Every structure is written in C-alpha cells, then in structure tokens.
Amino acid sequence: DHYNCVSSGGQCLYSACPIFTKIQGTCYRGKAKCCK
Ligand SMILES: [Br-]
Ligand SMILES: [Br-]
Ligand SMILES: [Br-]
Numbered sequence: 001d002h003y004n005c006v007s008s009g010g011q012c013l014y015s016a017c018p019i020f021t022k023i024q025g026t027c028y029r030g031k032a033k034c035c036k
Contacts, residue, residue: 002027005034 005012005025012027017035025034 001025008036010034010036 002012005027008025010024011021011034012032013035014028014032017023017033021035023033024036026032027034
C-alpha cells in the first residue's frame with residue numbers, strides 16, 4: 001500500500017515503472033504500482 005511503499009523507499013505510480021526500477025508493491029487500492 002502507499003504507506004509501506006513510501007516507507008520502504010519506493011514510489012507509487014499508475015504508469016509503468018521507470019527505467020532502473022521495477023514493481024515491488026502496490027498503492028491506491030491496488031490500482032497503482034510501488035516502483036523501486
Ligand atoms: Br509516492
Ligand atoms: Br511496470
Ligand atoms: Br508496498
């Protein structure tokens with residue numbers, strides 16, 4: 001979720017995860033990715 005995402009050093013994004021990151025969680029009732 002957003003809290004764990006940001007806490008552990010990720011970013012919540014609806015779009016694809018940017019270059020040099022990958023999906024490592026979810027945010028926003030499951031509709032966004034946690035990228036890191
Ligand atoms: Br964020
Ligand atoms: Br992605
Ligand atoms: Br997460």
